[PDB]
């Protein structure tokens, strides 16, 4: 979601 590297579903997701 709110990650910063791969997706989490909608958005960014932690490494």
Request: no cysteine.
């Amino acid at each position: 979601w709110x990650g910063w590297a791969s997706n989490d579903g909608e958005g960014t997701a932690i490494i």
